Amino acid sequence: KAGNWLPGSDAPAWLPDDLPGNYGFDPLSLGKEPASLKRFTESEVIHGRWAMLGVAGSLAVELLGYGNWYDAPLWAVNGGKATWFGIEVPFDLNALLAFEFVAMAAAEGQRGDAGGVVYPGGAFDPLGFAKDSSKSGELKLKEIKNGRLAMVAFLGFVAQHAATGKGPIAALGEHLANPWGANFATNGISVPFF
Amino acid sequence: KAGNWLPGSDAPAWLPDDLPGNYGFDPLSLGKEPASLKRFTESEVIHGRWAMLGVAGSLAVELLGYGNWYDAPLWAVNKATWFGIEVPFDLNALLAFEFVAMAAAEGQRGDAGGVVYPGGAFDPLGFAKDSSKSGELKLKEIKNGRLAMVAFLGFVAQHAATGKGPIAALGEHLANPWGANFATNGISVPFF
Amino acid sequence: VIFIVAGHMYRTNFGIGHRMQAILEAHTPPSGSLGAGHKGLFDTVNNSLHFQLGLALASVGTITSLVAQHMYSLPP
Amino acid sequence: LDPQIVISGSTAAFLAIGRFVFLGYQRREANIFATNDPAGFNIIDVAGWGALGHAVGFAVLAINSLQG
Amino acid sequence: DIAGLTPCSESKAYAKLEKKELKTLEKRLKQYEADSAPAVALKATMERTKARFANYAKAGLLCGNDGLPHLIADPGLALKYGHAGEVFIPTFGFLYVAGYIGYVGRQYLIAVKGEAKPTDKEIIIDVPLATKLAWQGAGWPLAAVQELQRGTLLEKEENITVSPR
Amino acid sequence: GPKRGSLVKILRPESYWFNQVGKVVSVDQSGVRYPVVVRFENQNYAGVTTNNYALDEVVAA
Amino acid sequence: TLGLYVHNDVMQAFGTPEKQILIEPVFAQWIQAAHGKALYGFDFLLSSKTSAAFANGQSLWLPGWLDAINNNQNSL
Amino acid sequence: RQSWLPGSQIPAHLDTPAAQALAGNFGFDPLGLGKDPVALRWYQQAELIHCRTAMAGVAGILIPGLLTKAGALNVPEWYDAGKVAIENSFAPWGSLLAVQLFLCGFVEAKRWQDIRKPGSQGEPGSFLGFEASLKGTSELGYPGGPFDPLGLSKEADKWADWKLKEVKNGRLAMLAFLGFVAQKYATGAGPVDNLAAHLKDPWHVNYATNGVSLPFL
Ligand code: CLA
Ligand code: CLA
Ligand code: CLA
Ligand code: CLA
Ligand code: CLA
Ligand SMILES: CC1=C[C@H](O)CC(C)(C)[C@H]1/C=C/C(C)=C/C=C/C(C)=C/C=C/C=C(C)/C=C/C=C(C)/C=C/C1=C(C)C[C@H](O)CC1(C)C
Numbered sequence A: 001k002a003g004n005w006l007p008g009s010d011a012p013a014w015l016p017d018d019l020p021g022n023y024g025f026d027p028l029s030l031g032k033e034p035a036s037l038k039r040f041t042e043s044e045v046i047h048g049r050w051a052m053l054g055v056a057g058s059l060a061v062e063l064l065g066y067g068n069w070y071d072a073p074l075w076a077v078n079g080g081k082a083t084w085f086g087i088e089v090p091f092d093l094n095a096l097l098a099f100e101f102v103a104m105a106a107a108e109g110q111r112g113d114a115g116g117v118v119y120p121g122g123a124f125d126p127l128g129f130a131k132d133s134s135k136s137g138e139l140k141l142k143e144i145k146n147g148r149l150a151m152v153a154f155l156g157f158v159a160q161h162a163a164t165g166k167g168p169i170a171a172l173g174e175h176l177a178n179p180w181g182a183n184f185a186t187n188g189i190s191v192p193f194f
Numbered sequence B: 001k002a003g004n005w006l007p008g009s010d011a012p013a014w015l016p017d018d019l020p021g022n023y024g025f026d027p028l029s030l031g032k033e034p035a036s037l038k039r040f041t042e043s044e045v046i047h048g049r050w051a052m053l054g055v056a057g058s059l060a061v062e063l064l065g066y067g068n069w070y071d072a073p074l075w076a077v078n079k080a081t082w083f084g085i086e087v088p089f090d091l092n093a094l095l096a097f098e099f100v101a102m103a104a105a106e107g108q109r110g111d112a113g114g115v116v117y118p119g120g121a122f123d124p125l126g127f128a129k130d131s132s133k134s135g136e137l138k139l140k141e142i143k144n145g146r147l148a149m150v151a152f153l154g155f156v157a158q159h160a161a162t163g164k165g166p167i168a169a170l171g172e173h174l175a176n177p178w179g180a181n182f183a184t185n186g187i188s189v190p191f192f
Numbered sequence C: 001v002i003f004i005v006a007g008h009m010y011r012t013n014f015g016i017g018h019r020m021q022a023i024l025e026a027h028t029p030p031s032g033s034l035g036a037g038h039k040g041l042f043d044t045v046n047n048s049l050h051f052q053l054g055l056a057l058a059s060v061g062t063i064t065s066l067v068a069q070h071m072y073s074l075p076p
Numbered sequence D: 001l002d003p004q005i006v007i008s009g010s011t012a013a014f015l016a017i018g019r020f021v022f023l024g025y026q027r028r029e030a031n032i033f034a035t036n037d038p039a040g041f042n043i044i045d046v047a048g049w050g051a052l053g054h055a056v057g058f059a060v061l062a063i064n065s066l067q068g
Numbered sequence E: 001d002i003a004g005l006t007p008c009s010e011s012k013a014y015a016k017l018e019k020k021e022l023k024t025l026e027k028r029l030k031q032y033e034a035d036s037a038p039a040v041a042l043k044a045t046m047e048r049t050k051a052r053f054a055n056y057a058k059a060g061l062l063c064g065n066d067g068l069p070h071l072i073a074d075p076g077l078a079l080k081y082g083h084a085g086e087v088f089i090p091t092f093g094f095l096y097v098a099g100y101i102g103y104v105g106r107q108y109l110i111a112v113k114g115e116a117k118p119t120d121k122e123i124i125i126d127v128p129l130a131t132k133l134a135w136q137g138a139g140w141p142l143a144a145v146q147e148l149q150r151g152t153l154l155e156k157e158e159n160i161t162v163s164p165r
Numbered sequence F: 001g002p003k004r005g006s007l008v009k010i011l012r013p014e015s016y017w018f019n020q021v022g023k024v025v026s027v028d029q030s031g032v033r034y035p036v037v038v039r040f041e042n043q044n045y046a047g048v049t050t051n052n053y054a055l056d057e058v059v060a061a
Numbered sequence G: 001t002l003g004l005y006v007h008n009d010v011m012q013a014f015g016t017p018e019k020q021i022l023i024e025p026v027f028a029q030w031i032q033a034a035h036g037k038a039l040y041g042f043d044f045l046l047s048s049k050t051s052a053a054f055a056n057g058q059s060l061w062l063p064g065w066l067d068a069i070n071n072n073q074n075s076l
Numbered sequence H: 001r002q003s004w005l006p007g008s009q010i011p012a013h014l015d016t017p018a019a020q021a022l023a024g025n026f027g028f029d030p031l032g033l034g035k036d037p038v039a040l041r042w043y044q045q046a047e048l049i050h051c052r053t054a055m056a057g058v059a060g061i062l063i064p065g066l067l068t069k070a071g072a073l074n075v076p077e078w079y080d081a082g083k084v085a086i087e088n089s090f091a092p093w094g095s096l097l098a099v100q101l102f103l104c105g106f107v108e109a110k111r112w113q114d115i116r117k118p119g120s121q122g123e124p125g126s127f128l129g130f131e132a133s134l135k136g137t138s139e140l141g142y143p144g145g146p147f148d149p150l151g152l153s154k155e156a157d158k159w160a161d162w163k164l165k166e167v168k169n170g171r172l173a174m175l176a177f178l179g180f181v182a183q184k185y186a187t188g189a190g191p192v193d194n195l196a197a198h199l200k201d202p203w204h205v206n207y208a209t210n211g212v213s214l215p216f217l
């Protein structure tokens, strides 16, 4: 068991203790059936990894000076040309959607052909950190905690841009410049009666 | 047992005698449980060492005369300096280097479970190879550390009151003692 | 185009296609909140003409309401 | 535009993707009569995946003709 | 304001309707004496009409093209534009008194089922027990949510069911 | 089956007093098919308050 | 529904139309404003000129739909 | 024993050892709300919390309102202090309310899980060093440790007296706050001004004369 999401409350009896990220958090009892719970473990790890790469991408776009994560498809929404680290990309939106559909269909289909593989190893694990079977549980726990933080961070990116309309680094600049005069309660959107 | 924080009162039965700074001071009974008491001994020693460093630093800044401890980040709320020599860095780079270095050092410290008095390369001069004078210096260490924690909170409260440095406020207290204290303040005692 | 594409869904004598009894037997949710789900409904819609007639009349009646509501407001 | 290139590339992409990564899943979910292919990728599989290819290719051509 | 509706104190058809009702009342008034009881009753009627129009203009009601007060039934829009007194406060007042009546009836039913003549206490009302439960029914929302949370608000499946189910 | 005066629960599904509680009058000890005489404090639509039941149609609850 | 109609009938009979319960259909007026009708002043999603749905459908099919829905001489 | 009405019958749920041992028991439940013992436990807790925050609130009304009639502490009226303070302040009231909702919600949920399970917030590991000093003190609603620093709850021969003083001062402060709201709506002046008016002319300046509280006379 990783910890306790609400102290003193008992853990649900369907969440096994030797599972990464087991804080006993299931109020709506969504994982009481084992096949559903197996699918949710798979989907939780997959969503966490995609959200890690997404938050790292949004941070690396905005910190390095190439707009925010919202300005990045605007060359294809408008009439423009792609760019990457300043270097141009000589492709159009239809061609890139073709490349992405073929590549993601192949990779996703090869992942889905496997039964319940979450932690494959082998070619996916070239540096051999999970070849120990004793620190592997600690690294999976670190992996699911960074992934949950990344999911919460990307939904924060989306909700913050829906409300204020700026990037997360500029929003953090405003929150450092005036923490009381710039937040979700000085927003005017998140709480309507403030 | 180093003494008694209030004479006449008894010592709590959860604080052992062979512990640096055991005056028996635990009114809230925060450390009646041993894991809590172990963590608080660790935290007390670490807070004492950081507060000794911070009080010695603020005294050194104001005595050498480059402002007080409150003027030192004013270039970055807005160019840095050290010993009067300007230092060529910016706030984001300083926060990056500090976060990396403190994360590394703190993480190496946190990997060890209950190490309060490490020795080794931390202790190059080897004062703690006697196991008795080392314990007396532990008692001196926890007393100096508590004194520096009280001194730093006094610095913060004294600056929030008067808006001046501690050495300048000590100069005011030596010049006009019955006209410059926490009561000519108008803040610490709200009346008059 | 949408109805011609949707008319290639079900399994006739060509190997490909969906099997309606398989779809109905699959859509039963976990936790038993709908019990057996849609189990055994293919042999009760297929064998009953009154079920099929009630479904057809419900759909055609709602579509006739749709015809009236959309033809007064959007006259063709 | 390049209509032959777009239609032929879209049909090639959908036929290749249904030939190589979705064939085993389609054989799992489905459970003319004889082909030389080592996967059993018959005329009706060719018809379905090339139908998806032509449909997506003409959709891409139409969206690019609208310039949207 | 809301939905294109002007406020009634700003509306002109509202003033026209007030003037028209006063005109009808004074055309009926102008055929009597002064201290006569029909004239006194019609002057009381005109006083109540002026007081009613002044109170509806004071309460901040919204009038339409016909000069008539319109009500706003949306909790957020009412609480935002100051219209909670017309639907929202009346619905919580009604739910308080309707649950009062229902909870007092339910407590009377449970009290009279525990005797040897429940139908007799249903035909001839036990007045002290009914007044006791009628005074004790003021804490009905608290008592109702407590009986909900204990699992005693609801009968189990020992209910009567048909052959089909 | 149940003794006289004890309370049972009816599980004949087409009975009026199905899933409800009555009181045993007597149980006949012959080869009669429905020996358990149960009285009910409420009447059915026919105005009858008494019915014969079987041994597997009553549960002493 | 019968109580509101009988209430308003008693108000119309007793010469007092200003007392009758006239609830405004704010939910369906909200939906008509979402469809692009600038009468009720909600001004959102097709009635506000700074909306994503307005700006995306504005080049091709919205200029006829807006004129037809803001015409008050038809059943649209 | 003592009662809110001599001669009235005490309700049978307020005459048990668990009810008679509580605090301030005078047999006052005419609406029968505490017939359920779980409800009486929850309502004991709700009374304790309303008592303590009502005393703190009414002290914040009275002591600045008494001392503002003397020389020091130029403090505005209690129905104007939020506006005057937020003009004096640095943050908007929405941000200040959001901060107090998070900071109160944490502490409140701690108390909530302690009401649900008494031995709950002393999980070994769940807190850094709080966890040892966050159990109850065998009576729910009366915590120990960092709450109650001075050790006044240590002597058992004073303990029912401290309980009963707390429940009486709390009920009286709740009456005081309902009075503050009522007088504010009726008269329009502060409560110290209302007290000065009732002392200046008792037989003519009261709630029978304000024209609001009973308008039939
Ligand atoms: C998004 C995908 C996702 C999935 C599939 C899971 C799945 C799981 N979680 Mg994880 N979790 C997630 C995201 C997810 N989580 C995030 C983002 C956090 C941080 C907030 C957590 C924090 C967390 C903790 C602390 C614990 C779990 C646990 C679990 C396991 C059992 C609980 C369960 O059965 O619920 C199934 C979950 C879902 C079906 C998620 C789908 C989302 C629901 C249906 C709607 C959510 C709407 C959203 C809140 C709206 C936000 C709007 C915004 C404007 C405010 C299961 C493997 C427990 C465990 O044992 O770990 C392995 C456990 O202790 N989760
Ligand atoms: C992942 C953590 C995280 C962090 C560090 C931030 C940080 C920020 N948010 Mg964002 N946000 C987040 C998640 C986060 N948010 C989520 C989950 C949502 C959807 C509910 C939003 C939706 C949102 C809106 C609409 C706005 C912000 C704004 C801001 C900025 C001002 C502070 C504020 O009012 O936040 C809002 C506070 C919350 C949403 C509550 C956070 C609850 C967290 C997720 C629980 C876990 C926190 C953990 C215990 C401690 C922090 C860990 C962190 C340091 C890594 C600040 C830079 C404002 C801005 O743009 O300022 C200029 C603003 O208007 N956020
Ligand atoms: C900075 C943090 C800190 C921590 C973690 C400790 C921890 C400890 N102290 Mg030490 N102490 C400290 C600072 C601290 N102290 C300072 C600054 C002084 C001088 C005032 C002392 C003087 C002192 C004496 C004389 C003794 C101890 C003792 C102890 C030990 C047992 C007490 C206990 O279990 O409570 C754990 C303590 C805490 C959890 C403290 C955390 C801070 C609390 C929660 C809030 C404090 C806020 C503070 C009151 C604000 C002041 C504002 C001011 C304007 C009034 C424990 C190891 C006893 C001992 O055996 O020595 C080892 C003992 O006899 N302490
Ligand atoms: C560490 C011990 C210590 C010492 C030597 C000083 C010294 C001073 N303080 Mg500071 N101060 C301290 C702690 C200390 N303070 C603490 C803990 C606080 C927070 C409560 C403050 C808050 C404060 C304010 C708001 C002000 C001062 C001011 C001053 C100066 C005037 C004298 C005075 O009124 O003191 C203040 C007296 C106390 C805080 C009460 C004493 C409590 C201490 C901690 C007991 C320990 C003292 C010890 C037994 C004897 C001294 C030992 C020392 C020689 C090492 C003087 C230089 C004033 C100033 O600016 O002068 C112009 C002023 O306005 N102090
Ligand atoms: C019976 C169904 C019903 C319907 C059709 C509406 C319709 C409306 N509500 Mg209302 N509301 C309702 C019941 C309903 N309400 C109930 C029961 C509550 C109490 C929980 C509220 C509390 C409420 C608040 C606080 C607000 C609204 C608002 C609105 C208006 C815009 C929001 C919308 O389109 O969401 C469709 C409605 C639903 C799906 C029904 C659920 C309503 C949820 C619980 C609240 C929705 C608030 C929404 C998120 C705020 C949007 C802000 C807006 C400026 C974009 C719209 C006229 C907003 C407004 O004032 O607009 C000018 C607003 O601020 N409602
Ligand atoms: C657990 C549980 C249990 C119980 O029982 C109940 C409940 C409570 C309900 C539950 C909970 C839940 C939750 C919380 C959920 C959430 C989730 C999320 C947030 C997700 C996300 C998730 C997220 C994700 C994936 C994301 C991803 C992202 C990405 C890729 C991005 C991308 C990008 C980038 C780079 C940038 C550019 O320029 C653009 C783009 C393209 C945009």
Ligand SMILES: CC1=C[C@H](O)CC(C)(C)[C@H]1/C=C/C(C)=C/C=C/C(C)=C/C=C/C=C(C)/C=C/C=C(C)/C=C/C1=C(C)C[C@H](O)CC1(C)C
Pocket (backbone or CB within 6 Å): B025, B026, B027, B028, B029, B030, B031, B047, B048, B050, B051, B053, B054, B055, B057, B058, B068, B069, B070, B072, B073, B149, B150, B152, B153
């Ligand atoms: C013991 C006990 C027990 C019982 O049971 C209960 C009770 C009573 C509660 C308890 C008590 C407690 C206490 C007293 C506490 C206090 C503390 C403190 C004061 C701390 C500080 C502490 C403090 C500290 C660390 C500090 C540190 C500092 C520092 C680093 C500084 C830094 C700096 C400098 C150099 C200068 C520059 O320019 C800036 C800065 C950045 C600013």
Ligand SMILES: CC1=C[C@H](O)CC(C)(C)[C@H]1/C=C/C(C)=C/C=C/C(C)=C/C=C/C=C(C)/C=C/C=C(C)/C=C/C1=C(C)C[C@H](O)CC1(C)C
Pocket (backbone or CB within 6 Å): H028, H029, H030, H031, H032, H033, H050, H051, H053, H054, H056, H057, H058, H060, H061, H077, H078, H079, H080, H081, H082, H174, H175, H177, H178
């Ligand atoms: C017992 C019983 C039983 C039977 O069975 C039945 C019956 C008879 C029904 C019942 C009775 C009941 C009653 C009487 C109740 C009442 C209560 C109250 C009064 C509360 C208050 C309560 C009250 C409360 C909490 C209050 C609190 C307050 C506060 C915080 C305040 C605050 C403040 C201040 C400082 C100042 C500023 O500037 C403002 C403010 C913000 C305003």
Ligand SMILES: CC1=C(/C=C/C(C)=C/C=C/C(C)=C/C=C/C=C(C)/C=C/C=C(C)/C=C/C2=C(C)CCCC2(C)C)C(C)(C)CCC1
Pocket (backbone or CB within 6 Å): C001, D011, D015, D046, D047, D048, D049, D050, D051, D052, D054, D055, D058
């Ligand atoms: C043998 C072999 C080979 C070759 C192959 C090939 C070359 C194939 C081709 C195939 C193909 C080439 C196929 C195709 C198909 C197609 C289809 C099947 C189509 C369909 C179409 C459709 C269905 C359309 C429709 C429509 C219309 C009519 C109008 C408009 C709209 C739409 C578009 C919808 C290789 C060398 C690789 C390898 C070896 C073996």
